Design a protein around this nucleic acid. Structure first.
Ligand SMILES: Nc1ncnc2c1ncn2[C@@H]1O[C@H](COP(=O)(O)OP(=O)(O)OP(O)(O)=S)[C@@H](O)[C@H]1O
Ligand SMILES: Nc1ncnc2c1ncn2[C@@H]1O[C@H](COP(=O)(O)OP(=O)(O)OP(O)(O)=S)[C@@H](O)[C@H]1O
Ligand SMILES: [Mg+2]
Ligand SMILES: [Mg+2]
Lengths: 298, 436, 287, 319, 277
DNA sequence: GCTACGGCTATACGG
DNA sequence: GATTCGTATC
C-alpha cells in the first residue's frame, strides 16, 4: 500500500494509545502519517489538545511510499484502536506482530496482527476531516512567561492528590528568587478549601525553573507567574505523567500551557513525544490572584 | 437583629397558633402513642406549610416526654453524608439507631425533612422501612411522628410520564396505600391557620414591637395591616415575615404574601360555580391557568368537569346547556392537548353556568371521576378473557380473538358451559361479571 | 496557638483509622485541644453511640499549646471540622511516605483572614513535597461524658484478635444487632437480626444469626461485680482502630468492656501507648 | 476588533441609586443595605426590569470588602442538584466569616425557578438550620416555580414592568455618556419597541446608532420592527375581513413571521383582549386552536390563517 | 420416584470433570436447568423456550451408584433446579477435595416440588465435618417432558470440521484464534465462513470490519458455508472447547451452527452438543 | 522478584 | 368553591 508499518513492541503502542483515552474514549482521533513517523492528534472543545509522536525507528519497518504528499491525515474513532492493540503480547515464544497500513483516501486503516499461526485483520474506515486547525492550540516560541522541568513521579503524585481532594479548579505558581530559590506549587480550589502542593526546590524534582518577562530571554527574579486552569483539562495529563521521567512546563502571556511529556524496544528511536497544550481560564475575578499571592507569602 | 418568626416563637403550648380541636386531637393521639402498648405506632401529620405541624410537636414533647421517661425530639437530618454509608441507607441507619430510644433514654422521633423521596429507588426504601417499623415484632418501640407538607411540585421536567411525586408532594405520593390504611397509623390532617388566631398572634407581635411601631408612627394603620394579612394568607410564618418586612420599612411599599395553590376540587368548583372575589371570568380563568397550570393542563380535570357539571342545580338545569357543555368537552378531546383546548373547555362551561346563574340554587357535592374504577374493571376483564383463551386452547383446539370474546364468547360461552357442563377447572360465569 | 506533629508511620496509621472512624460515625468531627492531650470525638445524630480518641502529648513529637494568645474554661479550645475533608488529608498516599504530619491552628489578631477560622495542616512527604491544606473549622463547646467514671458493674477483658476476625466476618449490610451473652463459665457473641412479618407472615425482613462462642481460656479477665444487645457497625469500626498501630512493646491487643443493665449504655475502651480509645454505645432496654 | 463592551454590560448599574424603576422597592433595598438586616427575599418579575443588578448591588453594598468570601452565586449554568445543595451550600452556610454587626452572608440563587424539587427540599433544611449567619436571595421570573415551604420563609418582592419615563431617564443617561445624537420621536420609538424592557431598549439604541447614527423614527423603525403582538392585536380587532387580511399579509407574511408564531401570538392576544364578550373570546380561542392543530400537522399556509380570520369575523358579526 | 446417586471425583477424574464442564456451561447460559434421569443415561438441558440450546449426554457408568426408579417410561423423572445452588455445592466439594480428601457424594431425592439431599464429608488436618445441602427442585410432568426434544441437525452436503485437540501443538493456537474476537468490547455478531480447509471470523459493521483467519492445518472428515452468530454463544463455545479434547464444528449455510463436544471414555462416550440458531 | 487478589475508582445503566 | 354539621361569641 501507500504506507506500511510493522512492529512487535505492542506494549509501547498500547501505552501511547492509553494516553489518548483521558480525552473521552468515544470520539474521533486524527492521525498524521509522514516520513518521521505517525502521530495521534486529539482535541476536546478547542480548549486542550494532545499530540503523540511514534517515530519511524520505533517500528521495525516504516516505508511510507507516499511520494506525492508530505503527510496524510485520516480521522477514525479512537475506541477501536484502544481495544485492538490491547493484545498484551502474551506467549513470548510467539510474539504477536503488529502491521499498520493505509493505502490512501477511501482506503481503510488496517491493523493486521500476526500470531504466527493466526493472522487477524481489522479495517477502520476513515471519516471526513473536520475543519479545525491544530496550529491554534499551540504555544509561542518567543513569549514564554516561565519554563519549568519537573520529574514525572512527583508531578503524577501531585495530580493524584489533586484528583483525590476534588480540585474543581487549579492554579499554577512560578516565582524565582535572586538567592537561587525556585518555588512551584499547584494551588487548587476544592471542597476542602484552599490547598497547596509545593514542589521541592531540589534539582532532583525541579531541574530548572526560569521565569521570563514575556520575551523568553530575560530572567526576572521576584516576579510571579499565575495560570488559572480548569482541572478538567489539567487532569488529562495525569495518565501521561505515569509513563514519563521528566515533564517540561511552558506558558506564555496569552494563557496557553504546553505540557511536554518526555518518555524514557529499539535503540535509535527517542521515545513518545506527548505534547498536551492547554488554555488558561479568563479569571474575571481579580481578588483571587491577590489571595493566591497572600497564601504563597504565608 | 433576627427574624420575627424566630424571636417570637411560642415558649408554651398556649401561644401556638392552632385550633383548639386540632390541638386536643393531637394531644390525645400523642398521649396514646406514649403508652407501653400503643395501638398507633406512627403519627402522620399532613397539611399546607406553616400550619404549626412542627410547632405543636416540639412543644408537646417538652410536656409529654419528661412524664413517661424513666429516670425533646430526635429530628432526622437528611444532609448527613457518613463515610462508608451509601445515600440510601442513611434513613435505615437512623431507624436502627432510633429503636433504642426507650425508657431511661425515651425520646419521640420526628421526621420533618424526609429523605430524597423524589428518586424512585429510595422512595421505595423509605416505604419499606416504614412498613418494617409498622410491622415490627419488637414489643417496645418509641413513638414516631412524620410531618409531610402538602405542596405542589412545580413543573420542571419535560415528559408526559410524570408520576404522582412529580405533580404533588403529599402523603399519598410518598406513602403507599398499605401504610396510609395501616391500622397502627394515625393521620391527623391539618388546615391553614384561620383569620382569628392569625389576627391575634400578629397583634401580639405588634404590641411587643410597640416601641418600633410607635416611633415610625405605624400604630394608627396597624389593624388595617393585620386584617389584610390574615385575610390574604393562612400561614403563620409568612404572615410574621410580611409583618416584619412592613414594620421595618420606611415607605409605602405594597406588602405581599406567598400565593396559595388552588386544589383540584377547589378549581373544579371555581370553574363550575365561579369565584366569590372576581366577577370577571376571563381574569379568573387567566389567573387559574397562570397559577395552577400543573392541574388544569391534565385529563383528570376535564374528566372531573364532566363528572361534576350535574351538581350545579343538583341536575335541575336545561338539557340544552348540558349538551353545550359536553359537546365542547368532546371537541376539546380532539385538539390533542393543545393549550387552546383547556382554555376553551374551561371557558365554555363557565359561561354556560354563568348564563343560568340565579340565587336560591341548592348545589350538589362534587366527586372524583370514576374512570379509575372503569379501568380496573377493564383490566379484570382482560385477565379473565386471557384465562378463557388459555383454557380454550389447551383443553381444546380453537383460536379466537379478544374482540370476538368481548362481543360473543364472553356471554354465550359462559351460558353454554353452565348448561352443557354444569347442568349435565373451567369458566362458567360471564367474563368480568354480568352487565348488572 | 496550637501546633502538633506526627513523625511515625504507625502513629500516622492510627491517626488516619482513628479519624476515618469518627468521620463514619458523624459527618463532622469535633476536636478539642488541651494542654496535656488532643481529644477527637464524634457523636451520633441519634445520640446513641459516641467514640472518643485522646492522643496524648507524648503521642506527638512536637506539641505546643498557647491558649492565652470557642475557648471554654473548665483553657480548652474546641473546633468542629468536616470528617470527610479531614480523612482525605490524613490518608497515606500510595508510593510515597509521610515524613511529617503537622496539625496546627494559630488564631491571633496578626494572622490573615485567609487563615482565620481555617485549620492549618502541613504534610511533608518522603519525596520532600510540601502539601498544605486549609480546611475550615467551626469553634464549638466541648461536653465531656461521665460514663468514664459513671461505670468505668461486671467487667470483660478479651483479646481483640479473634473478636476482630469474627466482626470482620460479619457484615453490617444485613446484620446490625450484637448479642454479648456472658456467664461465669463461658462467653458467646452472636450477630443476629430480627425478622419482622408482613400482613400475612410475609418475610419483610429475613433473620440471619452468626454465633461465635469463646471459651474462658481465651478470655483474659472477667469479674461479675448477662445478656446485652447493641449495634454492630460502631463496635466493628472501634475494634479496627487499635490494630492499625502495630505496637509490640505494649502487647495489648485487647478490649475492656463495662455494662450494668439492658438499659444503661455499654462502654468499650481500647488502650495504646499514646492513644486512649473509648466507645459509648446504648443498649437495648428490652429485659 | 476591540475591547469595547456592549452597552448592556458597559452600563450595568453598579450602585442601587442607578437602578431606575420600582422606586418603592429600590428604596427598601437601599434601606436594607444601610441597616444591614437582610431577610430572605424572592425577587420576581418580567425579564430585563433589573432583578439581577439589584440583588448584586445590594450584596456588594451590604458586604463591602467581604464580597469575595461572603457571597455564593449559584446560577442555572452551575449544577444546582441535590448534591451541591447538600455539600457546597451547606459548607458555605457553616462558614464562620466575621462580619460587621447586622451583616450576613448572601446566597444569590439566581434563576431559582429552574432548580429541581429535591434540591429545594434540601434548601428547606439549609435555610432552617443556618439562618443566623447566611441569607438566601432567590431571583426568578415566576414565583410559583419555587415550592411553597421555601416561599413561606422568604419575603416576596414583586418587580413590575418599567414605565416609559424611567427607561427614558436611563436612556438619556446613556446617551449623555456616549455623546449620541438623537431626536425625541426616535427615543419615543425606542421606548415603544422596548415594551418595558431596558435590555431590549439599550440593544435597539446601540443597533440604531451603529447602523445610522441619528436616533429618529425612520432610522429606528428601519432596523427594529414594531412589536408583533401589537400587530396581531390590530389584525384580530378589525371590523372587515378585507382590512384584517391586509394587516395579516402585508405586516406578518411578507415581513417574515412564521404562521405558527402568528397563531401562538394570537392565542396570547385573545387571552388578554379587552372589551370583548366572553362567548366571542372562547369561540376565538377555539378557532385559533383548530388552526394551530392544522399548522402543527403540516399545513402552515396563508390560506389557513385567512380561514381562521374569516371564522373569527363570522363569530364576531352574529355568533 | 426414588432417585439416589453416588459420585466420586477422585475415583474417576474425566467423567467428574465433564460433570464440571456441564454444570459451568448451564450456569453461564441462563438460570435453571432441566435434568432428565433416564434409567441408563443422564441429559442436562437448558432450553430458553434464537438463543442457543445445549444437550449434554451423561452415561450411567460415570457415577458409582445410579439407582433410578419411577412410574414413567424407562424410569424417567425430570427435574427443574436453580443452577446457582448446585453450582455452589459443587464448588464446595471442589474445595473439599482441593484441601485433601477422597469422600463421595451421597445425593438422594428427598421430598410437585422436591429437593436433593446432596450430603458429603470433609476432613481437615482427622476431623469429621458433615456438609448437608438441600436444593429445591420442581417435578416436570411427562406431558411437559415430551414437549422438550433435542434439536435436529442435517448435512445433506454441508460441512463439519474436525477441530484440532487442545493438547496438540495447534490446540493453543486454535484456542487463541477462537478467543481473539472476544477481546473487542463492541462486538455482537460474528460471521463464520466455510471453504473446502479454512475458517475465518468476520465481523463487518458500518465503519469497521474484522476478518480474523486461521493459517494452521485443519481436518475435515468425510461450497460456501456462512452463518451469523452472537458473541455470547462464541464465549460458550470457547469455554466448551477449553475443556474438551475432541471438538467437532459443523457449519450450515445461513441455517444454524452446532458445537459438538465428545469425550472418549472407552464404554459409552459422554457428548456435549450446543445447538445454535 | 513476580503473581493473585482485594480495595479503589471511573463509567454506563435504570427508574 | 359548594353543602352540612358544630361551636363561640356578641
Ligand atoms: N404563634 C405561632 N404559632 C406557630 N408557629 C409560630 C408562631 N410564632 C412563630 N412561629 C414560627 O412559625 C414557624 C411554623 O413552622 P411549622 O408550621 O411548625 O413547620 P411546618 O409545618 O413544617 O412548615 P414547613 O412545611 O416546614 S415550611 C416556626 O418556625 C415557628 O417558630
Ligand atoms: N431599572 C433599571 N435601571 C437601569 N438599568 C436597568 C434596569 N433594569 C434593567 N436594566 C439594564 O438591564 C441590564 C441588566 O438586566 P438584568 O437586571 O440582569 O435583568 P433581570 O431584570 O434580572 O432579568 P432576567 O431575569 O435576568 S431575564 C443592564 O443593561 C441594565 O442596565
Ligand atoms: Mg417546620
Ligand atoms: Mg440576569
Amino acid at each position: 500500500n501507500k504506507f506500511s508499518a510493522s512492529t512487535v513492541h505492542l506494549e509501547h503502542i498500547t501505552t501511547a494509545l492509553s494516553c489518548l483515552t483521558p480525552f473521552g474514549s468515544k470520539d474521533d482521533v486524527l492521525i498524521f502519517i509522514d516520513a518521521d513517523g505517525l502521530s495521534f492528534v486529539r482535541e476536546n472543545n478547542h480548549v486542550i489538545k494532545i499530540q503523540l509522536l511514534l517515530s519511524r525507528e520505533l517500528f521495525m519497518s516504516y516505508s511510507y511510499r507516499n511520494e506525492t504528499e508530505d503527510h496524510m491525515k485520516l480521522c477514525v474513532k479512537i475506541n477501536h484502536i484502544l481495544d485492538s492493540v490491547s493484545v498484551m503480547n502474551r506467549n513470548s515464544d510467539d510474539i504477536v506482530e503488529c502491521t499498520l497500513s493505509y493505502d490512501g483516501h477511501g482506503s481503510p486503516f488496517v491493523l493486521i496482527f500476526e500470531d504466527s499461526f493466526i493472522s487477524e485483520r481489522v479495517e477502520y474506515s476513515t471519516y471526513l476531516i473536520k475543519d479545525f486547525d491544530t496550529n491554534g492550540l499551540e504555544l509561542d516560541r518567543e513569549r514564554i512567561s516561565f519554563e519549568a522541568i519537573i520529574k514525572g513521579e512527583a508531578l503524577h503524585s501531585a495530580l493524584k492528590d489533586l484528583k483525590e481532594i476534588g480540585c474543581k479548579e487549579c492554579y499554577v505558581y512560578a516565582k524565582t528568587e535572586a538567592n537561587d530559590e525556585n518555588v512551584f506549587a499547584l494551588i487548587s480550589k476544592s471542597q476542602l478549601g484552599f490547598s497547596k502542593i509545593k514542589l521541592p526546590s531540589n534539582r532532583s524534582i525541579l531541574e530548572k525553573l526560569q521565569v521570563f518577562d514575556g520575551d523568553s530571554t530575560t530572567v526576572i527574579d521576584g516576579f510571579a507567574v499565575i495560570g488559572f486552569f480548569d482541572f478538567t483539562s489539567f487532569d488529562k495529563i495525569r495518565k501521561s505523567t505515569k509513563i514519563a521521567s521528566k515533564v517540561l512546563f511552558r506558558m506564555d502571556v496569552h494563557g496557553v500551557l504546553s505540557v511536554n511529556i518526555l518518555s524514557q524496544l529499539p535503540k535509535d528511536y527517542p521515545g513518545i513525544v506527548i505534547e498536551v497544550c492547554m488554555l488558561e481560564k479568563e479569571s474575571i475575578d481579580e481578588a483571587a490572584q491577590t489571595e493566591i499571592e497572600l497564601l504563597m507569602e504565608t | 437583629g433576627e427574624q420575627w418568626y424566630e424571636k417570637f416563637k411560642p415558649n408554651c403550648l398556649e401561644q401556638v397558633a392552632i385550633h383548639k380541636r386540632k390541638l386536643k386531637d393531637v394531644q390525645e393521639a400523642l398521649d396514646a402513642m406514649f403508652l407501653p402498648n400503643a395501638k398507633h405506632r406512627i403519627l402522620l401529620l399532613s397539611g399546607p406549610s406553616g400550619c404549626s405541624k412542627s410547632t405543636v410537636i416540639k412543644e408537646l414533647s417538652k410536656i409529654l416526654v419528661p412524664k413517661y421517661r424513666q429516670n425533646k425530639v430526635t429530628e432526622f437530618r437528611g444532609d448527613c453524608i457518613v463515610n462508608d454509608l451509601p445515600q440510601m441507607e442513611s434513613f435505615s441507619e437512623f431507624l436502627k439507631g432510633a429503636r433504642y430510644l426507650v425508657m431511661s433514654n425515651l425520646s419521640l422521633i420526628l421526621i420533618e425533612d424526609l429523605p430524597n423521596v423524589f428518586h424512585i429507588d429510595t422512595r421505595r426504601r423509605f416505604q419499606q422501612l416504614i412498613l418494617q417499623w409498622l410491622y415490627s415484632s419488637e414489643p417496645l418501640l418509641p413513638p414516631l411522628v412524620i410531618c409531610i407538607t402538602e405542596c405542589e411540585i412545580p413543573e420542571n421536567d419535560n415528559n408526559y410520564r410524570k408520576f404522582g411525586i412529580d405533580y404533588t408532594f403529599s402523603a399519598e405520593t410518598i406513602m403507599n396505600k398499605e401504610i396510609l390504611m395501616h391500622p397502627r397509623l394515625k393521620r391527623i390532617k391539618f388546615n391553614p391557620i384561620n383569620s382569628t388566631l392569625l389576627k391575634k398572634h400578629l397583634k401580639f407581635i405588634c404590641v411587643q414591637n410597640m416601641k418600633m411601631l410607635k416611633e415610625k408612627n405605624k400604630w394608627n394603620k396597624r389593624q388595617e395591616v393585620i386584617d389584610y394579612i390574615a385575610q390574604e394568607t393562612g400561614d403563620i410564618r409568612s404572615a410574621i415575615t410580611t409583618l416584619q418586612f412592613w414594620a421595618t420599612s420606611s415607605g409605602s411599599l405594597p406588602i405581599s404574601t406567598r400565593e396559595s395553590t388552588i386544589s383540584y376540587f377547589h378549581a373544579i368548583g371555581k370553574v363550575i360555580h365561579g369565584s366569590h372575589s372576581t366577577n370577571n371570568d376571563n381574569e379568573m380563568i387567566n389567573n387559574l391557568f397562570e397559577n395552577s397550570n400543573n392541574l388544569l393542563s391534565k385529563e383528570d380535570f376535564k374528566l372531573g368537569i364532566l363528572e361534576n357539571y350535574n351538581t350545579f342545580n343538583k341536575g335541575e338545569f336545561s338539557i340544552s346547556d348540558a349538551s353545550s357543555i359536553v359537546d365542547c368537552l368532546s371537541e376539546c378531546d380532539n385538539m390533542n392537548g393543545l393549550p387552546e383546548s383547556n382554555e376553551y373547555g374551561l371557558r365554555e362551561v363557565r359561561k354556560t353556568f354563568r348564563n343560568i346563574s340565579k340565587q336560591g340554587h341548592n348545589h350538589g357535592t362534587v366527586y372524583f371521576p370514576r374512570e379509575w374504577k372503569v379501568r380496573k374493571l377493564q383490566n379484570s376483564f382482560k385477565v379473565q378473557a386471557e384465562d378463557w383463551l388459555n383454557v380454550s386452547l389447551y383443553k381444546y383446539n380453537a383460536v379466537h380473538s379478544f374482540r370476538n370474546i368481548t362481543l360473543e364468547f364472553g356471554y354465550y360461552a359462559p351460558l353454554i358451559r353452565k348448561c352443557q357442563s354444569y347442568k349435565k377447572i373451567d369458566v362458567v360465569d360471564r367474563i368480568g361479571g354480568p352487565i348488572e | 496557638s496550637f501546633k502538633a506533629t506526627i513523625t511515625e508511620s504507625g502513629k500516622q496509621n492510627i491517626w488516619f483509622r482513628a479519624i476515618y472512624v469518627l468521620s463514619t460515625i458523624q459527618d463532622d468531627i469535633k476536636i478539642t485541644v488541651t494542654t496535656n492531650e488532643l481529644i477527637a470525638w464524634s457523636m451520633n445524630e441519634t445520640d446513641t453511640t459516641l467514640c472518643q480518641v485522646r492522643f496524648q502529648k507524648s503521642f506527638f513529637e512536637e506539641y505546643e499549646f498557647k491558649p492565652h494568645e470557642g475557648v471554654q474554661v473548665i483553657k480548652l479550645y474546641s473546633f468542629r471540622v468536616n470528617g470527610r475533608h479531614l480523612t482525605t488529608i490524613s490518608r497515606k498516599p500510595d508510593g510515597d511516605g509521610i515524613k511529617s504530619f503537622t496539625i496546627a491552628v494559630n488564631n491571633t489578631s496578626t494572622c490573615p483572614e485567609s487563615l482565620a477560622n481555617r485549620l492549618i495542616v502541613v504534610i511533608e512527604m518522603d519525596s520532600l513535597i510540601v502539601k498544605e491544606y486549609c480546611p475550615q473549622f467551626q469553634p464549638i463547646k466541648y461536653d465531656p461524658i461521665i460514663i468514664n467514671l459513671k461505670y468505668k458493674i461486671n467487667y470483660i477483658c478479651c483479646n481483640s484478635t479473634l473478636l476482630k476476625n469474627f466482626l470482620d466476618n460479619c457484615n453490617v449490610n444485613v446484620t446490625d444487632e450484637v448479642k454479648l451473652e456472658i456467664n461465669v463459665h463461658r462467653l458467646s457473641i452472636t450477630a443476629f437480626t430480627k425478622a419482622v412479618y408482613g400482613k400475612n407472615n410475609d418475610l419483610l425482613r429475613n433473620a440471619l444469626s452468626m454465633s461465635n462462642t469463646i471459651s474462658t481460656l481465651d478470655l483474659e479477665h472477667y469479674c461479675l461485680f448477662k445478656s446485652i444487645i447493641f449495634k454492630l457497625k460502631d463496635f466493628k469500626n472501634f475494634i479496627t482502630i487499635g490494630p492499625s498501630w502495630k505496637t509490640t512493646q505494649d502487647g495489648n491487643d485487647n478490649i475492656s468492656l463495662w455494662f450494668c443493665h439492658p438499659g444503661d449504655p455499654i462502654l468499650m475502651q481500647m488502650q495504646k501507648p499514646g492513644v486512649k480509645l473509648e466507645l459509648v454505645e446504648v443498649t437495648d432496654s428490652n429485659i | 476588533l476591540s475591547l469595547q463592551l456592549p452597552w448592556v454590560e458597559k452600563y450595568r448599574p453598579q450602585v442601587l441609586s442607578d437602578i431606575v424603576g420600582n422606586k418603592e422597592t429600590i428604596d427598601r433595598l437601599q434601606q436594607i443595605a444601610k441597616d444591614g438586616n437582610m431577610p430572605h427575599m424572592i425577587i420576581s418579575g418580567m425579564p430585563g426590569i433589573g432583578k439581577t443588578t439589584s440583588v448584586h448591588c445590594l450584596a456588594h453594598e451590604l458586604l463591602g470588602r467581604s464580597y469575595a468570601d461572603g457571597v455564593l452565586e449559584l446560577n442555572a449554568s452551575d449544577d444546582r442538584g441535590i448534591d451541591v445543595v447538600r455539600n457546597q451550600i451547606k459548607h458555605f452556610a457553616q462558614k464562620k466569616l466575621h462580619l460587621p454587626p447586622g451583616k450576613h452572608k448572601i446566597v444569590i440563587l439566581d434563576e431559582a425557578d429552574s432548580m429541581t424539587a429535591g434540591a429545594q427540599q434540601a434548601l428547606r433544611r439549609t435555610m432552617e438550620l443556618y439562618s443566623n449567619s447566611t441569607r438566601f436571595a432567590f431571583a426568578c421570573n415566576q414565583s410559583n416555580k419555587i415550592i411553597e415551604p421555601l416561599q413561606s420563609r422568604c419575603a416576596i418582592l414583586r418587580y413590575s414592568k418599567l414605565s416609559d419615563e424611567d427607561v427614558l431617564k436611563r436612556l438619556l443617561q446613556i446617551i449623555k455618556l456616549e455623546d449620541v445624537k438623537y431626536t425625541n420621536d426616535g427615543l419615543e420609538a425606542i421606548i415603544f419597541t422596548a415594551e418595558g424592557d431596558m435590555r431590549q431598549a439599550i440593544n435597539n439604541l446601540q443597533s440604531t446608532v451603529a447602523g445610522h447614527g441619528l436616533v429618529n423614527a425612520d432610522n429606528v423603525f428601519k432596523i427594529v420592527d414594531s412589536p408583533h403582538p401589537l400587530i396581531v392585536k390590530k389584525m384580530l380587532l378589525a371590523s372587515n375581513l378585507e382590512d384584517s387580511i391586509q394587516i395579516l399579509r402585508t405586516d406578518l407574511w411578507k415581513k417574515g413571521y412564521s404562521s405558527i408564531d402568528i397563531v401562538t401570538t394570537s392565542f396570547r392576544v385573545t387571552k388578554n383582549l379587552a372589551q370583548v364578550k366572553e362567548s366571542v373570546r372562547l369561540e376565538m380561542i377555539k378557532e385559533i386552536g383548530l388552526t394551530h392543530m392544522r399548522i402543527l400537522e403540516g399545513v402552515g399556509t396563508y390560506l389557513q390563517l385567512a380561514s381562521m380570520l374569516a371564522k373569527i369575523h363570522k363569530l364576531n358579526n352574529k355568533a | 420416584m426414588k432417585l439416589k446417586l453416588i459420585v466420586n471425583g477422585c475415583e474417576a477424574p474425566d467423567d467428574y470433570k465433564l460433570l464440571r464442564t456441564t454444570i459451568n456451561t448451564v450456569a453461564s447460559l441462563r438460570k435453571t436447568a432441566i435434568l432428565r434421569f433416564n434409567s441408563e443415561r443422564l441429559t442436562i438441558i437448558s432450553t430458553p423456550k434464537d438463543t442457543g440450546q445445549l444437550w449434554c449426554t451423561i452415561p450411567h457408568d460415570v457415577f458409582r451408584l445410579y439407582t433410578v426408579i419411577s412410574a414413567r417410561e424407562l424410569n424417567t423423572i425430570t427435574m427443574e433446579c436453580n443452577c446457582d445452588s448446585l453450582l455452589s455445592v459443587f464448588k464446595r466439594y471442589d474445595r473439599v477435595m482441593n484441601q485433601g480428601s477422597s469422600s463421595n457424594m451421597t445425593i438422594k431425592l428427598q421430598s410437585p416440588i422436591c429437593a436433593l439431599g446432596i450430603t458429603f464429608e470433609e476432613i481437615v488436618h482427622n476431623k469429621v465435618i458433615m456438609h448437608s445441602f438441600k436444593v429445591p427442585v420442581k417435578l416436570l410432568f411427562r406431558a411437559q417432558d415430551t414437549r422438550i426434544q433435542e434439536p435436529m441437525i442435517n448435512y445433506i452436503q454441508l460441512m463439519m470440521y474436525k477441530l484440532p485437540p487442545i493438547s496438540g501443538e495447534f490446540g493453543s493456537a486454535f484456542h487463541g484464534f477462537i478467543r481473539r474476537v472476544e477481546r473487542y468490547s463492541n462486538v455482537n455478531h460474528i460471521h463464520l465462513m466455510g471453504v473446502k480447509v479454512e475458517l475465518k471470523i468476520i465481523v463487518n459493521e458500518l465503519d469497521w470490519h474484522l476478518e480474523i483467519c486461521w493459517n494452521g492445518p485443519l481436518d475435515s472428515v468425510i461450497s460456501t458455508h456462512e452463518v451469523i452468530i452472537r458473541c455470547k454463544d462464541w464465549k460458550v463455545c470457547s469455554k466448551l472447547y477449553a475443556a474438551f479434547e475432541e471438538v467437532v464444528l459443523a457449519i450450515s449455510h445461513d441455517e444454524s451452527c452446532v458445537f459438538h463436544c465428545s469425550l472418549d471414555r472407552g464404554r459409552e462416550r459422554g457428548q456435549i452438543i450446543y445447538y445454535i440458531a
